[PDB]
Amino acid sequence: MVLEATVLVIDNSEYSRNGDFPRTRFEAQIDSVEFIFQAKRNSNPENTVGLISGAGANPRVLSTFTAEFGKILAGLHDTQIEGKLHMATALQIAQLTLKHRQNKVQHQRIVAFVCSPISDSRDELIRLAKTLKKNNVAVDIINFGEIEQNTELLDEFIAAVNNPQEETSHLLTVTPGPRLLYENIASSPIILEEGSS
Template identity: 60%
Template sequence: MVLEATIIAIDNSEYMRNGDYLTTRFDAQLTTTEFIFQNKTSSNPENTVGLVAYGGSGPQVLSTLTNDFGKLLSGVHDTKISGQNHFSSGIQVAALALKHRQNKVQQQRIIVFVGSPIEESEKELEKLAKKMKKNNVAIDVINFGEESINTSKLEKFNSIINNHENSHLVTVPPGPRLLYEVIASSPILLEDGELGGGDFGDYGVGNFGAGDGLIDASMDPDLALALRLSLEEEKQRQDREAEAAEKAKKDAAESSELEKIDEAKEDENQNEEGNTKDVNME
């Protein structure tokens, strides 16, 4: 099992609002990010993963290298969509985060999502690729959403950065398969011809937004556990909401019943007062 430090660089530019991938490019990307984290950390317990967003006004480190899924999730859900793609500076910030890894034995890898047009020229990308290769940083690129614009640039970038097949370019056009499903069976997550965390085929990913199915626990116990916990949390939330709704309904019914009793008592009192007046008149 490869010992790696991986920085996932996500595209949070305005283009990520597009709904050509379920449910949006941004959501598809986050689901895949969570999947990659689980795959990397389950394939080797000493692997660490960090998170960088490179849209908005510029790159931002959302999570330093960790194997704590909660820290990555916190970074993921704090991300906002804004601005434009800053591909080159995003890669450089990710490389800087890798440089500060505690375990220097870990190989360095960046997995970058590209879902908006890359502004840099081929010459600028060539210079960036040579710099990363010199620093022994492998880069996997997930090219989706604007593949007609970016593919030629990214193919050239990959041809330069690739060192003995350590870097990959996966282009994913819109289609029936979910983004994470394509990445699950791609060279990005394949190790010696086998998927590090299990090939999930047509399984959904429960609370990660990719469907209502469940993952076979025999394929990846850690991911199955994480998903089960997510499902349990969602079920508990739904149960609490159902209990609150039932309580509100019961309280409303009791309140209505009390109002009817009060009205009946008031009518009864009025009748008694009327009868008393009649007796006095007699």
């Protein structure tokens, strides 16, 4: 399936600080990641992902490019739990991240938790979306927001990135309730179905 590089964008933030379904959102993030990434490395071996901090007051990579457990290793340690949006920056990093993605012919992909109220500007958002589509990044987002984060950038964005779907962007905006993220997104073409372009 997938030969492309991915990035995992985690906000550990006003949502992740706060359990959206067990045990925390931020924790609900976690095993969903490996779940995803498993299927990602099951998509193909060599399928690579990044992991950054969209959380806190500091954007940064948490797990760099790899292809196995070293992420699951890397993700093992915490984050600022109540932290705040670096998303644009984080994404813009995740972009540059994918600009260094290893042994290319790997297309660019990004997977983004939304644990933050999502403060950004539409143009910047779409400049990202442009830059992505320019860079030709696959972009799928994990969002359970207040309301959710939607009718917003995230909605324009997946569109704005997207001439072709998974060569640019697909969306899922995570729902509340006994909605297991990995169970939820098992549906969405964030994972499975058609996996790359």
